[PDB]
Each structure stands twice: as structure tokens, then as C-alpha cells.
Amino acid sequence: AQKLAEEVPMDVASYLYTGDSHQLKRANCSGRYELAGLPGKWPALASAHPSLHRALDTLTHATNFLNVMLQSNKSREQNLQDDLDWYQALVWSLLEGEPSISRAAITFSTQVFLQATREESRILLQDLSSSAPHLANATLETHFKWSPPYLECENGSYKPGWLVTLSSAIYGLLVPEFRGVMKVDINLQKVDIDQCSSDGWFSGTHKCHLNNSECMPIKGLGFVLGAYECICKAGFYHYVCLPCREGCPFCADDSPCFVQEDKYLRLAIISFQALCMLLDFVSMLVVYHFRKAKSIRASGLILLETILFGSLLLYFPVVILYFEPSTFRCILLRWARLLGFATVYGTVTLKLHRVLKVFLRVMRMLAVILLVVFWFLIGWTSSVCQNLEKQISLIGQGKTSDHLIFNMCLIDRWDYMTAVAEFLFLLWGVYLCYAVRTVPSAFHEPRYMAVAVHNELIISAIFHTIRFVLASRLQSDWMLMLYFAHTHLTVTVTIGLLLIPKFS
Amino acid sequence: SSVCQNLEKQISLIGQGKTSDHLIFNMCLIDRWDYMTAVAEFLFLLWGV
């Protein structure tokens, strides 16, 4: 409607859309404009500047004045002596009242009329029909007469200004009739208009509807189009308002907000991780086949398969942290860590305790610490889920280093003291191995395990250290190498020292 | 540690009251930890028994 309604006035669209001197400084008009529909629905001073009210006020004052005056009894029609002076001074003061009332006429015949227009400072006035006086439209009516914006031209180029008129028909004086027509016209061209108003002058926000849309319009200049600036709300800007590439505002570009990946790297990483877990399972089967010469008695078949189930319980964290951080990730992480940890190293150290008694009842020591670890997962798990899944803190976090973003599983002071557990439960065995210093068998099994223990203490301490130190400025790739590296190092090691000799 | 490093000042507290019908009463209170505490005491003395 409004869009198709723009193909209305040729050599005026510069005066309409640009509101420009192309249709004004040089464009043959030979006709005044007409807002009888080029306005809003009708605004009728319901969508009003105050100036409308001021104009109507002076109008109605003069209207009542002349009506009651003409309603004076015995209407003489005495236009001879001085009544002409009264009407002349009246129209002078009239057009002198409004600084933007350009021309105005007043006719009274119960063809000739008084008129005046602002030349520079005086009311260029003469007893001749001018400004406005529509006896024709008053007879057609046979209230006041609203009017239309215009242009300073009837058979000429439309000069500066677009003229909106106010007009009325002089009610006569014991009945009434049409006895005159008085009307003025003011410049409806320096009149601020609103394309994005809720209701205004034919407000159409046809530049920013929804697509990250806001209209932050150009408020008051005058009767000019293209005066409704729009804003591109939280996305890109290339009359283009666009989204972001992601839920990541400040999209001066539509660039991405995440780290660059190294997928090809990650494939082989995971494959090699499966390699080690394959070796784990495989060697468990190796055990359950070849169980009948020295190793079987000195080293429990049971206790071996314990350790391997440990390693297979253990290697998960890697395959985890290739995948994305959901909160359900982090918890499995804590699960696998502590379970593989205790389940292996308990049996390890207990063998040595038994050795030490031979110097001078296994599982009824081990199931204890497995118990305590069960308890722990439960306690901490519930204390985060039931009471912190929703309320206060967030675990899976989108943390940013510098330009980019990355998700990750986060920490808590809990896992600090957990690492410290690792410290001490090894350090026991370390005391153990040290003072048990010279003690025989055809294996140097104690030297083997003691090696494991010194290894893991120093090195798993380090791994936990270099994760907790600077996690808040990590990418999601350097970390993975860390996990891969330390777990392969220490634990493939601590497999091999036990398994290697027990073939040859 | 959980208290003294996270929820000391930031978001939560313990000095805390509820109401019977429309009247006030403050106290300390609980979370899941005291639950697990109890269950440990239980099992410990079970072994003793």
C-alpha cells in the first residue's frame, strides 16, 4: 500500500522521498501539492504538534468574534465608512499573529475579499481575494474546513514551502447561512515527521522490521523523508542488519567466536588411546591363558586382572575431553579417575605389606578403600547436583582467553585435596619400599613396584599441578595433550613393569 | 573449604531462619553432607558390633 503509493508524484519524489531541491530548485510543478491521503489516515490534529492547537485557537477566537459581531442585530452591511478598515486591521493582526502563516484571505458576502501575505515584515495586504477563501467548498458543505499540504505553485515552479491550510465558512446571521469564507495557509514543509512512530504522519518503519531490528529515528528536522535511522540489534551490519555467527555479540564482523580445531590430530590421538586400552583388555586375556609357571603364584592372577580392570576403568578421561563439556561429563571424569587410582594402587601396596610380613587377608583390606571412594562419589555428586545444578554456580563454562571462546569442565577445591590423597597413599608405599631394602626373591619385584611408586608420585603430582595452575588460560587442545601424555607415561609404565618379565 | 572459599560471602550462608505458621525462627541448617556423615557413623559402629 504505502510502498505502491510512492509512485504518486513525478518530479516530486525528490521533494517527497529526498525532500530535496531536485524537485524544488529545478522542476516544473505548475500545481500545488495535496495531502488528502498523502497524510496519515487523517491526523486531524489528533496526531498533533502544538502549533496545530495554536492555529486553531487563534482561528476560533477570530471566528467567535466575527460571528457574534455579525450576529449583532440589524446587520447593516455597512462596508462603506470604516468596516473595511476593521476587516483590514483584523487580517493584518491575523497574519501577523503567526510567524509561519504565509498567506490568508477573508471573504464576506451574505467574489471580492481581503487578503494578505507576509512579504518580509509587513502584511502585504490588499482588498482582493487571496490566501484562502473557498465559498465553493462552503456551498458544497451547504464546523471548519481542514485542508491539505501544498506547494508554492499553480502554474509555476513550486517555490520553497508546502502549504497546509485552515479554512472555515462564515456562518451568516433569525437563521444562519454561508456569508463568507476565511482561510490561511502555513508552511507544512519545515514540519518534522515520523516514519517509525507508533502513530504519526503515515509512519512506516519499512527499513528495520525484525531482523535484529531497531528504529532509532531522526526525530526533528522538518518535512523530510529518510529520517528514521535504524539500529542493527546485536549482530552484523552488512540497509543491512544481520545476526551474529553465534550467541556471541559484538559482531562487528560475522566471524566466529570459538578456537580453531585440529581434528586430524585428534583422530590419531583417540586411536592411540584405544590402542592402550586394547593392550589392557588383550593382556587380561593373555593372563587368563598362560597362568601356570612361576608368575601365577607370586603374582595373583586375580590381582593382575584387578590392575588391568583398573587401567581400563582408567583411560576414559581422554575420550571424554575430546567430546564437548556438558556437566554430566565432568562427573564421569571424577568417577573414573579415583576408581582406577585406588583399585590399582591398593592391590599394589598390599602385596608389599604381605611381603613385609613374610619378612617376619588381602581383599578384606581392599574393599575398605573401595567403599570409602564409593561414599565419596555419592556425597560430592549429590552436593553439586541436588543443590548446585540449578541454584548458584555453573560447572560447564564458556571461558574466553583473548578473541576466542572455549568450553571446559571446571574444578573445585575438592579435587585439590583429592590429588593430595594421591600424594600420601603413594608415600606410604615409598616408606615401605625404602626401608624394605635388601629383601630377596628371584625377581626384584620390590624394585619394580618401588619404581612405579616414585614415578607416580612425582609425575601425577605434576600433572595435577599443571592442570590446576593455569586452567583459566588454556585452550582446549594443549590440555588434551596433557592428559594423554601423563596418563600414557605413568600408567603404561606401571603396567609394563609388572607384565614385561612374566613371559621371558 | 567449600564454605570458606566459595559460599562464604558470595551467595549462601548458614545463619538462616524459617517460619512455623507466620512467626520467625533462625538457626543453622543442613545440606546433603550431614546425611552422608550420619550414614558413615552407622556403618562404623556396625563393624564394631
How many Cβ pairs within 8 Å bridge chains A and B? 29
* Feature table: binding site of A: 102-103, 152, 185
Query: What are the φ/ψ torsions at residue A152 (nearest 5 degrees)?
Result: -75, 70
Q: Which string of DSSP letters, residue by residue, matches B3-27? A: IIIIITTSS--S-EEEESSS-EEEE
Binding residues of A for glycine: 102-103, 152, 185
Experimental method: cryo-EM
Write the single-letter amino acid at A74. K
- DSSP string across A27-87: ----S----SSSSSS--TTTS--HHHHHHHHHHHHHHHHHHHHHTSSS----TTTTHHHHH
Beta-bridge mates of residue A215: A230
Q: Which residues of B touch A417 (CB under 8 A)?
A: 1
The CA distance from A171 to A69, in Å, is 11
H/E run at residue A146 = strand A145-146
Chain A residue numbers with beta carbons less than 8 Å from the beta carbon of B31 are 383, 387
Name the E strands within A344-436. Answer: 396-400, 405-409
Q: Compute the nearest-CA separation of A490 from chain B (Å).
A: 30
Contact between A413 and B5 using a beta-carbon 8 Å cutoff:
yes
Residue with C-alpha cell 560430592?
A380
d(CA B26, CA B20): 11
Q: Which among A108, A164, A158, A97 has a CA at the least distance from the CA of A133?
A: A108
Residues in chain A within 8 Å Cβ distance of B10: 392
A393 vs B contacts (CB less than 8 Å): 6, 11
Q: Please, are residues A124 and A2 in contact by the beta-carbon 8 Å criterion?
A: no
CA distance A95 to A102: 7
| A393–B6 C-beta distance less than 8 A | yes
Using the beta-carbon criterion (under 8 Å), do A379 and B32 form an inter-chain contact? yes
How far apart are the C-alpha atoms of A341 and A311, rounded to whole Å? 9
Query: Who contacts A448 (Cβ-Cβ below 8 Å, separation ≥6)?
Result: A497, A498
Give the C-alpha separation, A181 to A109, whole Å: 9
Query: Nearest residue of A to residue B34 by CA position?
Result: A379
Q: How far, in Å, are A226, A315, A431, A497 from residue A500 at the CA level?
A: 83, 20, 25, 6
CA-based nearest residue in chain A for residue B2: A413
Contact B1 A417 (CB under 8 A): yes
Interface of B with A (CB under 8 A): 1-2, 5-7, 10-12, 31-33, 36, 39-40
3 state DSSP class of A125: strand
Nearest CA in chain A to B35: A379
CA distance A382 to chain B (A): 7
Burial class (CB in 10 A: 0-12, 13-18, 19+), A473: exposed
* Neighbouring C-beta atoms of residue A294, cutoff 10 Å: 11
In three-state secondary structure terms, A465 is helix
Q: Which amino acid is present at A47? A: S
Taking the alpha carbons at both ends of chain B, their separation in whole angstroms is 34
Q: Could B31 and A387 be called an inter-chain contact, meaning their C-beta atoms sit closer than 8 Å?
A: yes
CA distance A497 to chain B (A): 37
User: How many CB atoms sit inside 10 A of residue A194's CB?
Assistant: 20
d(CA A187, CA A49): 14
A159: DSSP letter: B
Helix (H) or strand (E) holding A415: helix A413-435
Contacts of A383 in chain B (CB under 8 A): 31-33
Partner-chain contact A414 B7, CB within 8 Å: no
Terminal-residue alpha carbon distance, chain A:
93
Minimum-distance CB partner of A413 among B1, B36, B39: B1
Distance from CA of B14 to the nearest CA of A (A): 14
**CA–CA distances in Å: residue A502 to residues A16, A305, A352, A495:** 96, 14, 18, 12
Residue of B11, B39, B40 with shortest CB distance to A392: B11
Cα–Cα distance for residue pair A467/A442, rounded to 1 Å: 40
CA separation for the pair B38, B30 (Å, rounded): 12
**Chain A residues close to B34, C-beta within 8 Å:** none
**Residue numbers in B near A392 (CB within 8 A):** 7, 10-12
